[PDB]
Subunit: 196 residues, 10 copies
Amino acid sequence: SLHLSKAKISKPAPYWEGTAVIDGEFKELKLTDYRGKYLVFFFYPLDFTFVCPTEIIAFGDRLEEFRSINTEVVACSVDSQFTHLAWINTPRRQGGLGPIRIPLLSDLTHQISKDYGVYLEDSGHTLRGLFIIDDKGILRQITLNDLPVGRSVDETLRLVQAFQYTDKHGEVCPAGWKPGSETIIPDPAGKLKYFD
Amino acid sequence: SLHLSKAKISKPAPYWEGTAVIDGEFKELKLTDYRGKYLVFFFYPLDFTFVCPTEIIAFGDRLEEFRSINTEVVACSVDSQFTHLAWINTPRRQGGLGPIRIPLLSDLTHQISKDYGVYLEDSGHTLRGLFIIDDKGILRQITLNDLPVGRSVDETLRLVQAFQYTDKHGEVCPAGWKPGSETIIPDPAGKLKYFD
Amino acid sequence: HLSKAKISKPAPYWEGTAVIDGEFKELKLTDYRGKYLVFFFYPLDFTFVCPTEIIAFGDRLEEFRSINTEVVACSVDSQFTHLAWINTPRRQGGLGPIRIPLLSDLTHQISKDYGVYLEDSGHTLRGLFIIDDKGILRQITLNDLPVGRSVDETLRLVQAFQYTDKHGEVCPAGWKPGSETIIPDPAGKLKYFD
Amino acid sequence: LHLSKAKISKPAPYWEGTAVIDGEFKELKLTDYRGKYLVFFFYPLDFTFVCPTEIIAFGDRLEEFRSINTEVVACSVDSQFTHLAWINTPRRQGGLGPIRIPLLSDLTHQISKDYGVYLEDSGHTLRGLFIIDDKGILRQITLNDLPVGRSVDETLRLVQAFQYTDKHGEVCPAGWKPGSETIIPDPAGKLKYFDK
Amino acid sequence: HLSKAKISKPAPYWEGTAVIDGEFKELKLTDYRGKYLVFFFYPLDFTFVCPTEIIAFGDRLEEFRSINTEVVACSVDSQFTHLAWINTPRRQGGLGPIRIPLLSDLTHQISKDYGVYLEDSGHTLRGLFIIDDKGILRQITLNDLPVGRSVDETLRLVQAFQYTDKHGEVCPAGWKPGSETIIPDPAGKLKYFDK
Amino acid sequence: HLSKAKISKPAPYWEGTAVIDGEFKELKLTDYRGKYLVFFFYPLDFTFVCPTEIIAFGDRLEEFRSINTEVVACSVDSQFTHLAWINTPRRQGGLGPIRIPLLSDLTHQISKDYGVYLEDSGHTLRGLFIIDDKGILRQITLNDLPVGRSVDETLRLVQAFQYTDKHGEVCPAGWKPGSETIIPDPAGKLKYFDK
Amino acid sequence: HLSKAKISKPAPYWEGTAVIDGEFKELKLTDYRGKYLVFFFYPLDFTFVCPTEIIAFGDRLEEFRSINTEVVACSVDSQFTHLAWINTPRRQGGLGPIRIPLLSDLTHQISKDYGVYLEDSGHTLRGLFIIDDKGILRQITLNDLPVGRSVDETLRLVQAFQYTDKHGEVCPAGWKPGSETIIPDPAGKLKYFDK
Amino acid sequence: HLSKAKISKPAPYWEGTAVIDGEFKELKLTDYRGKYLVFFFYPLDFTFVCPTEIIAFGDRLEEFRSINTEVVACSVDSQFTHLAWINTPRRQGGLGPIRIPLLSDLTHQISKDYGVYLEDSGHTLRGLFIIDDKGILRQITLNDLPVGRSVDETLRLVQAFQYTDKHGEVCPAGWKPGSETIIPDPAGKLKYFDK
Amino acid sequence: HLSKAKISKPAPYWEGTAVIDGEFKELKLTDYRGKYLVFFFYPLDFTFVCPTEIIAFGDRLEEFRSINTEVVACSVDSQFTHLAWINTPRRQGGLGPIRIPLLSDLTHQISKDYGVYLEDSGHTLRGLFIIDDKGILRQITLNDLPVGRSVDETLRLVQAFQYTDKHGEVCPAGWKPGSETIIPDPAGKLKYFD
Amino acid sequence: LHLSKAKISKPAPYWEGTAVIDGEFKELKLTDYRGKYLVFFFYPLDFTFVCPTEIIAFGDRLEEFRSINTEVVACSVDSQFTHLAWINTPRRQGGLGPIRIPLLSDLTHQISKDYGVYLEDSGHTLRGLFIIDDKGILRQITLNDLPVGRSVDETLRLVQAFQYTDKHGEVCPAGWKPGSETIIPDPAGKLKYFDK
């Protein structure tokens, strides 16, 4: 036994489609609906659990920071749309989500999880996997966390900003780059402007 | 064609061994040398390039922040040990590394890169892949960046700290957790202490 | 169409996490040896026909228990979702507290072994299995999604299998306790048919 | 492993053969029944025990099916010549006497095997009943071990229920009979049923 | 076209439920070791040529038993149909009481092993097998559906094989008890041909 | 055991050199279309039971011809051997003149196709085949080596197949021309059985 | 073209029934160990070139026996055919009495092993094999059907193999007993060639 | 053991470089259509029996050419070694000038196609093939290493095949021009055997 | 051991990035049609025998160019490492500026096609290939790691192949321009041997 | 594709056969040469052109190899009988005359094929030369197309070089001959050679 997935960095993100809960309603959603925008596509283990609601809420409460840089966010677990909706209709105080502006996509058949290489065969759900997909549908970044440890909205934002910067300019982003940081001309002569 | 690797989160990190440059000298190095400590094991594309030296230097200048939490750092590219050494002997001003305290591991056969799933078959080198491996040799975290965008030492530190926290305590780390942040008892009754 | 479930052969082994009296417990088919088991799958928590079936069996559990029969319900939902559904009031389509274990089949292994998994939907249809005290599968009832099962019919079948286990005689169409039975012999059958 | 071509919500597997209908041999085809519901049932063996009671039970209540546009066909592995002899045997001798339900012959066993009801060790079927709708789709499968007969009441209840759900945008609760409350399968609409 | 039945090899083993004297009994081929056996298949219970053949052998069973030979009939019908047929009077195409076991081959395994199963019809053709006291298949006769077998011919063949088992001579065309036989030797044969 | 001969299917095609009226001729199964054919194998020229069978049929050939039926015999021997055997007087176990073609199956292909070839012996058993005017195999009779076939039984079978080809009725056990037949119908059959 | 016969390897084992002095005997290749054997196939009994070859060798057998060499002939015909052919006078193309065994290869296995079997004809070509006292195949001669072999050439070959088995020298083209031979050495050979 | 060479089929095609009249020339089997060809392999240049055989055929080539037959010799040696051997005087085991083409089979393809290659030794045995004017293989003679072939026997065989090509009669054992032949007919044969 | 490189067959096609006059350029085997090519692999940049061989050929390039022959060196190193090595002074084991292209084989495809890739080491041995103006492979020289090649021997071979391409005659052992040649004919060869 | 068993730095493929040695046939084995260096070379064909010049070139300079503990063996597909005739042919006739180098025969072609020098279209070898060390390891492979002979000088230079590097911890630069400067294969030690 060894690890298989369709997700490859610099190649089109694996196509997905299914039912999502969007503003309390069931809707058809597909990867290609986001063509033209960056997409932060992330999986979480299970509705009605622990680290999961904090990550959905963390992104959800900061959604405008993504939308103002032309970036959408979609969360996905193996739960049904009916469980997603019941979880949204559970108050935050009870480990619920409350109203949420991020689509919750359902992957009940597990095909989307397997395609993205985040499915845990022994558990029947996913680990914490996040995928940054560009406006052309190309996969740029993959972040996979073991179960006990949540993700960072700050780090996700920095990555989206850096990919959009390098999309638009001839230069590349050094370690720890934030908007306004110095960049490098990827040329053996050009690079010296940065290194001096 | 689809994506293969031996690296699986919650399973032992794929074994590796080879020649590294360690304090200007060639030495035998192997994954199991780090048993007993956390390891941040990361690949970078190519010696004498652009984003690569900034990431090695960023980690290298902050190495004591890793060592004080019982964590080592190893960098790896497909370059030979001789190229690594020549790069270390190149002043930072010329895009060189200068003296460095992080081992530079050589993966000339590409077997280590393929095992870790970071090898780019069309390019002959790796993308930017970072792996956090615990003191028991188990893989906890995988971060893969497309070429133009460097990694973050801050985010790597936060992850190491969070994994070590959840190793030691019964609780799990919510989104954006830093030392001193609130955590959750992964219990449907216990969790309410956090959510209230 | 493939399955391990075959009438008159041992029921396919299963094990997993169930919610039992509000708590997570490991549950196994072998825990039921010595008793009859009604083991049924329903599609999805927080749906429509499913709560009515679970509630129907739960509220009538004593009619099974007084004839040495237990009842277990299973869906592909997680134990965390099972528990949330139980903590949801009946008038909201929830289960309320419930005396029947809710087995979780997240990996879909159990559903596939039993032949009830719908590949294109990601959940089960309405599949019910009657398993005897020796662990042998006696009865399979599979319903399409829109139509619920009958506790009365399920009880009748359990009683009939128990009657025929105990007695040398067999059970005619519609048999209920107190109805005529047949000696399965070419000469003996005549006492029934005359 | 158990193989079968019968799958709920797919076309019932096609069959054709010789049946005894009103004392005569006739070619009978599953497609003869398009436009009507069909109760299609297998019984182990002619000149046995539970089998005649099930055939007579359905036969004597046949107008109850015919008034809801539903036909009934019985099948065993016996030849048509044996079916005809069994019919010509008085009910008091465990014969059928005259009957209005066709007795389909499956001498080659291909029909039994297609329906997943054939017993390889025994050479005849178990007690398998199949409810097929007017569009030829399989809706319901009931398999009994040998000792225990089926119920006409229950078969009637199921036919009625499938026909109700075909016509209405509502679904049938546990134990539903004509005149019982039904549910709207929507997370908001469902409450009309549950609030009670 | 395949079967396990080969002349001069052990007849393929069989076992199943037969109706014997109105009762269900387990019957096996090895129950006949030490006797010749005429083992024959017929298409279907409650048909036409089949009852005449079963009755013809049954009514003449002593002609077999007095030469240490038994007769068993087999079809794909169940033992319950066999018994019903037996309980049907001859005038109605029934068998009446019968002294020959009626073997049931519901699973079709025996028929296929004997190479007599018709895949398109779900029953056997008219196949008859003569098996010696050591269990070796000596003779195979297979008829299409419309034409019954001959008890006289079957008797002739059993008698011929028993004669050749016992003596060193072989049986000419049309041989009956009392007929001339041949010494199977290029010199010895001349005693027969020079007449 | 493998063969292409199956009852109710076209008899397997054969062609080869036969000795006919002391001459070598090409003969084909399809030469016989439009008439019944009795096609039978015998083990070996210059042996024992084999000549008696060829002579038995040959001496009674007009009984076949007068019911539109031909007879062809076949062994694995060459046509040169067949002709020598015909040219050997009956009293030395020879055939003498004969009116039945002796087909040669030197390559063994015909014997194998008919499932009568004995791999350990290099020759056939005694296999007889009745083939109708349409080329359909109707009857198969296989004898172990020591026991010869019967001309009477062969005639009876051919007459019975021709009767059932021509009429709606089927032939009971032991049927001969003039015997009662059965209407193969649950109602019609009662004419025969009601006794 | 497939065969097990290879020069300088053990001749392929054979066994079968042969006619020897008018009797059927089991004969085996290994019966001939310790002597040379001329083993030859001929197409068919009761034919044309075949009897002349058998007679040619048979009439000159003492020339073989006196160099410790036996002769065995084989065709696909049966032993019964072989005996009839021996019992047919030479003037009718028969063999008459003969002192060479006639081996029967009825199953065709021996012919196939020797690569002489003609699949389209069902019999062999004219293949002759010279096998030494150790069972090693030394010589292979295959003729198409129309042309017979030579007893003189066969003797010459056997004498030459026996000479080279016994001496250090090899036999030139056309060598007969008494002819010059060659020392198979770059230096030694010059004794022969220096002319 | 495998080869493409089969009697009564087209001889396997070959082509390569031969030494002809001291020169290198491309030679192909089809260059001989319209003539008989004696095509023979010998183990190795600069050996022992081989020069005697090549010289024996060469010195007698007119005996072939006057019956419309050509002779070609072949070994696995290169054409350069063939020419060196030719330029070696006979007294030294050389060939001297020769009128027969010496074909080179360095790749071994021709030898393997003809079934004469010895895998353990890297050269051929002594294999001779007679091919008719239509290109059909008529005769195969294979000798173990120590024993040469006969020009006289080869001539006899070519003459016999040409005789049987031309006339309807076949050649008895030891046939030479002038000898009695046989009409291949069971009646016609009697004109030969009755003498 | 597998390779696509076969003497007297077209040299295996290659293409990749080379450093040529300090810049990255796409280079292809087909760019050399019309000329002889000396195409050689060396193990690794910043090593020991390798710079001496590259420098030996570079400093003597005119001896190849004046006979219509070009020279290309290849290792598994990146073009970025090739360029750094060129920007390293000779006295430090660097190449200094160089007039011979340095082809990069990072993917190892070219090395494998040429049969010179060492699986356990991740780089090539010392493999040199002489390819004629029609793109046909004429000569293969493979050295174990510790021993460098000879520009004098390589030049001799190029000259000999060019001589025999032009003339009907062949080149004896040790042949240099001006040495005796042989007519490859059994009669003609005698003018040489007498 | 080109197949061969000959690999540099692995044991030279074993061979054995009949050779002509001092006018006589003798069994010769690769392992006869253990303890000594071996120059093992193939030539196309006896009684040809370049081949005799190479054999004589090596033969006349054989003491130059013998004084450095190195033996020479030549091989072609010709038989031993042809080798012997060629030897017994005067040099003036393109013969070899007497020679001190064994001529190994490879009639079956197995040796040529094992060494990857056999030409399938032609049935003989190209000009392949192999330098095998005293431990039986293959060090050097030189393959020439047919028209062009090999050099004894160069073969000598290579033998000397491999023997020098076997004994010393230094390696041989391009064009090395006895008495030439060598390099210490260490990044520090190398400078002693390069600083010049």
